[PDB]
DNA sequence: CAGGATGTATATATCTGACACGTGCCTGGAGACTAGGGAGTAATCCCCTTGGCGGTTAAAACGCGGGGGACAGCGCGTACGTGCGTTTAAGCGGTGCTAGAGCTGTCTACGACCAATTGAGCGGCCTCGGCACCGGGATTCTCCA
DNA sequence: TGGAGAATCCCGGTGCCGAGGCCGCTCAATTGGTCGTAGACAGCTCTAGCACCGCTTAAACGCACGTACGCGCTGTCCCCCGCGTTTTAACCGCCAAGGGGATTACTCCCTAGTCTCCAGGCACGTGTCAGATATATACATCCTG
């Protein structure tokens, strides 16, 4: 009878409430705030993993590689806006050429 | 002279990753300088992070906290 | 003997793949040289310099992208150090 | 003999829910866990300072909703707002 | 009649030792009300709210114009042009 | 036309305070668009900063907090 | 009851420059500056105490945060003031 | 009796301790932390105000306005890099001219 | 180089609005004393870091032709710089009104907190299949005679 | 321009080691009750934010003329790239020594908490004087000679 079952989310609600409580963010934590935070974290995880699995499908591997995660977040525009100041380890860069660099 | 250990084709490989075709012959000392000053900017913060913990070994955790200070945060070692 | 298309092949190879570009032990000892300046006889985790290498060269290739854009803006294809201080001052360092 | 908490199994369940045939590597698993930890810290810190800005000692769902609207770009922000709102009314409709 | 390029250089110093606001207050106020009406209707603004909005606006404007000036200098030119603005917002990361 | 309320000599004055000598003719509406997207990014944060407070009047305080959120914190208006 | 740090920096200005005054806009800027430094230093000390699983913030975290987020000579003279003040305070 | 007089400072120790308590930075706060923070705010305030007073002095003015604070901040390369992401109202910019814009053969 | 033409710096008269200083008061900081739990300190141990040997070879160092790009010089045509007449809207002052910020009183529902209960979650272990890698053949692919 | 040769893609086979599921324990999540106070709601106040009108005045706008500067073209030379040869330091693998990070246990003292008191800091009022405004004058550049 976990709270994540009645919240409908696979992400933990009690763990998020525990980290919100002794994380000294505030002295009082509401009831719907951990389930809202867990829902947003669920959505962001799903948004990462959907294009990660899609890039794995174009790369014809069934394992998520940090290169696949980097290609997922850098090819998607608001995902790159959210993740502009992070660097992904073993992820590389997008393959791009400036138009004046090609010969002829 | 171990700053020279970052070697003549290493800047070339990093520039080819960066999408640069032609590079000058005087570029190497300048990027060695910017890599050196970046490393003393990050390593010093990692050293004080280690020093506050009464520790004499540098982990990767305080390294990524020092990266988090400069807005250059890193994923894959903060677990 | 192709005149200039080896560099484009190297560009495509290195942007296609994702291994570590800077050679390991010279970097691993350059970390030791810089760390001796702050506190002596410092021990280092292997994963610490493993994270530091991917921290350093990601910044380096972002900088090289920036001076590539500066060199294209200067109607050239060869990067000079003047594009490097362009990138550093304009981006804010 | 130690204990280390992580969100490996939860994003595993999310991954098998959205892609029931794709696996994940351990390095990518740590990248995933560090990403969700960083955005959790970002939203929690913004909600904390936003409650401090209104001299409120309680973090309700409104603070989380406002911090989500701040830290996320537009249609992603209102899609996350919709997911959070339907989760709150799903939890409130149940006991 | 002045040589073209020296009275502008003269009033460079006049606007550079100065400290007041360059843009007129009323068109900026009307522009701010126009762009803020789309997010939520019938808003109200404090007098210092639109005064603080202009401060960062011209601060960001002249911080961008420093950048476009010394980006157009590097291309062996004097005239600033819109591709130096693209260079400034690209190297700063504000565009991509 | 209210975006054009901020004008050619005002843009030329702001660029002149920025230290430029010669200005092309295609500069002005480009920096008009730059100012428009900058005020979009600031005002979008500020409007929900007022909206959370059960408030419908934008003060100077939440503008300062929005500018602190974009990493361009401003002094002289409290905070 | 609006809370501010005006008269403290007024005594600081009088003991560092006893023949000048300060405007009210510069007063707002100085108050915002000292508040921004307070928030930055206290937040760094907060997350530094959290990083080591310590619930107490003492002068060690404040000193290390000062060494972190201030530049070199500024931080060196800042800790030179800070430890001298903590030794003057702990002696009485 | 006043803890600032005990620490020999002008900034309030008790007020810094109070906003450290209610600023929810930790569950508990020590005794040397507010006096250390008060000493740091002492030194930083003294350093900005000294160069501000000098910038007022060579401008032959006995009043500190934000242009003097801007001149004090950007002249020295320590507090300028401390708060490089900070804009000051009524501040202006340092007078800087790139050398390629001056006329020659004059 | 040398003499007019202006824009900028310097010197009084003054005047006004912001700024320095005095006053009450009240709320927030200080004095004193206790509880307890969080930090300090010590002993153990075992993982992980440091150091060394030695074979191997990929990679770095070096040298040399050559070609193509950086850079200097020159011509041009146009597009901004500068000045002047004119319109126009910003700025300032006045009135007037009301929507909406700010604060005080209540109470109640929501959240902290503790005891009892238990099952999801995490360390250890084991297995097999996705994937890295080697090798041969087909497929582009780019330079030239 | 066909084609010689070089790089690349692809398919088949192999072998490996880390994903991924199972199992046992455990401690953190859940449930139930209490009780304390944070904020939701109403209502009163009052203040500053639109809303409009009139003057005035310096800023903006349109236009005329010019010139210098951005851009296109050409020559040159030099310096970096491609490639062959030589060397050298990184990589892999393995083996010990021990160092200190982490864990657990026991104490102690330091800070939260509470009560009482009093004085420092803030809102407000008011002189007052230093920067703003105006007028007159020297002078430091630029423009053409």
Neighbours of D, requiring at least 3 CB pairs below 8 Å, are A, B, F, H
Q: Which backbone phi and psi does G60 adopt, to 5 degrees? A: -70, -45
SS3 labels along A48-100: HHHHHHHHHHHCCCCEECHHHHHHHHHCCHHHHHHCCCEEECCCCCCCCCCCC
Domain H2-87 architecture = Orthogonal Bundle (1.10)
Q: Contacts of residue D52 in chain H, CB cutoff 8 Å? A: 23-24
Tell me whether residues C5 and A103 touch, CB distance under 8 A: yes
Provide the token pair at A2: 């976990």
Nearest to H8, CA basis, from G82, A3, A82: G82
Chain F contact for E73, CB < 8 A?
A: no
Q: Contacts of residue F69 in chain D, CB cutoff 8 Å? A: 70
In whole angstroms, what is the distance from residue H49 CA to residue G9 CA? Answer: 9
Task: Give all domains of chain E, ordered by start, each with its CATH number.
Answer: 7-91 (1.10.20.10)
Provide the token pair at C81: 């150090």
What residues of G are in the B interface, CB distance below 8 Å? Answer: 48, 51-52, 60-61, 64, 67-69
For C16 and I108, how far is CA from C1' in angstroms?
63
Provide the token pair at F54: 């059960």
* Window 21-60 of chain C: CB closer than 7 A to strand J: 23-26, 43
Breaks in chain B after (C-N > 2.5 angstroms): none
Helix or strand holding residue A28 (H, E): strand A28-29
- Are C77 and B15 in contact, with CB atoms under 8 Å apart? no
Q: How many Cα atoms are found within 13 Å in the side-chain-facing hemisphere of C3?
A: 1
Strands H86-88 and A28-29: unpaired
- Are H84 and E59 in contact, with CB atoms under 8 Å apart? no
- Tokens 């001219």 belong to H97
- Tokens 């003719």 belong to F25
Q: Is B75 helix (H, G, I), strand (E, B) or coil?
A: strand
Do E and H touch, 3+ Cβ pairs within 8 Å? The answer is: yes
Q: Is G57 helix (H, G, I), strand (E, B) or coil?
A: strand
Do F and C touch, 3+ Cβ pairs within 8 Å? The answer is: no
SS3 labels along chain E: CCCCCCHHHHHHHHHHCCCCCCCCHHHHHHHHHHHHHCCCCCCEECHHHHHHHHHHHHHHHHHHHHHHHHHHHHCCCCEECHHHHHHHHHHCCCCC
Q: Which residues pair with B22 in a beta bridge?
A: C78
In whole angstroms, what is the distance from residue B56 CA to residue C45 CA? Answer: 11
Q: Which long-range contacts (CB under 8 A, 24 or more apart) does F47-52 make?
A: F47/E36, F47/E39, F47/E40, F47/E43, F48/D66, F48/D69, F48/D70, F49/D53, F50/E43, F51/D66, F51/E40, F52/D50, F52/D54, F52/D62, F52/D63, F52/D66
Strands F73-75 and E79-80: unpaired
Q: Is A29 helix (H, G, I), strand (E, B) or coil?
A: strand
Task: Give all domains of chain F, ordered by start, each with its CATH number.
Answer: 1-79 (1.10.20.10)
DSSP character at residue G37: H
Task: Give all domains of chain D, ordered by start, each with its CATH number.
Answer: 1-93 (1.10.20.10)
In whole angstroms, what is the distance from residue G15 CA to residue G9 CA? Answer: 9
E45 C-beta less than 7 Å away from strand J: yes
Q: According to DSSP H, which parts of F1-79 are helical?
A: 8-17, 28-52, 60-69
Q: Contacts of residue G46 in chain A, CB cutoff 8 Å? A: 24
In whole angstroms, what is the distance from residue A21 CA to residue A30 CA? Answer: 10
Nearest to H85, CA basis, from F70, G70, A83, C90: F70
- Are G37 and H41 in contact, with CB atoms under 8 Å apart? yes
- Are C67 and C82 in contact, with CB atoms under 8 Å apart? no
Crossing angle for the helix pair H32-57 and G24-51, nearest 10 degrees?
Answer: 150
Please give the span between the terminal C-alpha atoms of chain E, in angstroms, as a whole number.
46
Neighbours of C, requiring at least 3 CB pairs below 8 Å, are A, B, E
Burial of G36 (0-12, 13-18, 19+ CB in 10 A): middle
- Tokens 């073993």 belong to A90
- Tokens 């401090």 belong to D52
- Are C5 and A103 in contact, with CB atoms under 8 Å apart? yes
Could you tell me how many CB contacts below 8 A there are between chain F and chain G?
Answer: 18
- Are C41 and C48 in contact, with CB atoms under 8 Å apart? no
Residue of A nearest to G56 (CA): A24
Tell me whether residues H27 and A25 touch, CB distance under 8 A: no
Burial of G53 (0-12, 13-18, 19+ CB in 10 A): exposed
In whole angstroms, what is the distance from residue D87 CA to residue B11 CA? Answer: 51
- Tokens 């975006």 belong to F3
Largest alpha-carbon pair distance within chain D? 49
In whole angstroms, what is the distance from residue G25 CA to residue G31 CA? Answer: 10
- Are H23 and G42 in contact, with CB atoms under 8 Å apart? yes
Q: Which residues pair with H64 in a beta bridge?
A: G22
C-alpha dihedral over C60, C62, C68, C74, to 10 degrees? Answer: -110
Provide the token pair at A88: 């992904």
- Are H79 and H73 in contact, with CB atoms under 8 Å apart? yes
Nearest to F48, CA basis, from E48, D51, D70, D61: D70
Q: How many Cα atoms are found within 13 Å in the side-chain-facing hemisphere of G33?
A: 30
Resolution (A): 2.8
Residue-wise DSSP of A1-15: --HHHHHT-SS-SHH
Q: Where are the domains of chain H?
A: 2-87
Tell me whether residues H31 and G73 touch, CB distance under 8 A: no
- Are F65 and F76 in contact, with CB atoms under 8 Å apart? no
Residue of A nearest to C4 (CA): A103
Q: Which residues pair with G57 in a beta bridge?
A: H29
- CB count within 10 Å of CB G76 equals 12
Give the contacts of F22 (CB within 8 A, at least 6 positions apart): E5, E78, E79, E80
What are the b/e assignments for A26-36, b being 16+ CB within 10 Å? beebbebbbbb
Provide the token pair at G27: 């007063």
In whole angstroms, what is the distance from residue B48 CA to residue C39 CA? Answer: 9
Please give the span between the terminal C-alpha atoms of chain F, in angstroms, as a whole number.
35
Residue F7: C-alpha distances to residues A67, D64, E11, F32, H45 (Å): 48, 41, 18, 9, 40
Crossing angle for the helix pair D61-71 and A32-58, nearest 10 degrees?
Answer: 30
In whole angstroms, what is the distance from residue D83 CA to residue D80 CA? Answer: 5
For C13 and J81, how far is CA from C1' in angstroms?
18
Experimental method for this entry?
cryo-EM
Burial of F25 (0-12, 13-18, 19+ CB in 10 A): exposed
Length of chain E: 96
- CB count within 10 Å of CB C22 equals 21
- Are F10 and E24 in contact, with CB atoms under 8 Å apart? yes
- CB count within 10 Å of CB F8 equals 12
Nearest to E87, CA basis, from E70, E73, E71: E71
B57 C-beta less than 7 Å away from strand J: yes
Please give the span between the terminal C-alpha atoms of chain A, in angstroms, as a whole number.
68
Q: Which nucleotides of J are covered by protein (CB under 7 A)?
A: 7-8, 18-20, 27-31, 38-40, 48-50, 59-61, 66-71, 79-83, 89-91, 100-104, 110-112, 119-123, 130-131, 141-144
Q: Contacts of residue G33 in chain F, CB cutoff 8 Å? A: 75
In whole angstroms, what is the distance from residue C83 CA to residue C64 CA? Answer: 9
């Amino acid at each position: 009878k976990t709270r994540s079952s009645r919240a409908g989310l696979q992400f933990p609600v009690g763990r998020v409430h525990r980290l919100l409580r002794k994380g000294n963010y505030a002295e009082r934590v509401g009831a719907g705030a951990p389930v809202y935070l867990a829902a947003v974290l669920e959505y962001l995880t799903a948004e990462i993993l959907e294009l990660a699995g899609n890039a794995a499908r174009d790369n014809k591997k069934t394992r998520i590689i940090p290169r696949h995660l980097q290609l997922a977040v850098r090819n998607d525009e608001e995902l790159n806006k959210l993740l502009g100041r992070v660097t992904i380890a073993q992820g590389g860069v997008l393959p791009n050429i400036q138009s004046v660099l090609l010969p002829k | 002279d171990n700053i020279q250990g970052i070697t003549k084709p290493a800047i070339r490989r990093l520039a080819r990753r960066g999408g640069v075709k032609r590079i000058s012959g005087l570029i190497y000392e300048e990027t060695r300088g910017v890599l050196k000053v970046f490393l003393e900017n990050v390593i010093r913060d990692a050293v004080t992070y280690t020093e506050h913990a009464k520790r004499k070994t540098v982990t990767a955790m305080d390294v990524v906290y020092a990266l988090k200070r400069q807005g250059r945060t890193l994923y894959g070692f903060g677990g | 003997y192709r005149p200039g298309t080896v560099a484009l092949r190297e560009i495509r190879r290195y942007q296609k793949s994702t291994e570590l570009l800077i050679r390991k032990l010279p970097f691993q000892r350059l970390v030791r040289e810089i760390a001796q300046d702050f506190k002596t006889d410092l021990r280092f985790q292997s994963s610490a310099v493993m994270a530091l290498q991917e921290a350093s060269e990601a910044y380096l290739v972002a900088l090289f992208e920036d001076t590539n854009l500066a060199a294209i803006h200067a109607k050239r294809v060869t990067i000079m150090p003047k594009d490097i201080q362009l990138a550093r001052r304009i981006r804010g360092e | 003999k130690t204990r280390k908490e992580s969100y490996a199994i939860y994003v595993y369940k999310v991954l098998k829910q959205v892609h029931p045939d794709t696996g994940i590597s351990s390095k990518a698993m740590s990248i995933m866990n560090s990403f969700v930890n960083d955005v959790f810290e970002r939203i929690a810190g913004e909600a904390s300072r936003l409650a401090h800005y209104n001299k409120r000692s309680t973090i309700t769902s409104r603070e989380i909703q406002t911090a989500v609207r701040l830290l996320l770009p537009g249609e992603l922000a209102k899609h996350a707002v919709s997911e959070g709102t339907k989760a709150v009314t799903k939890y409130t409709s149940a006991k």
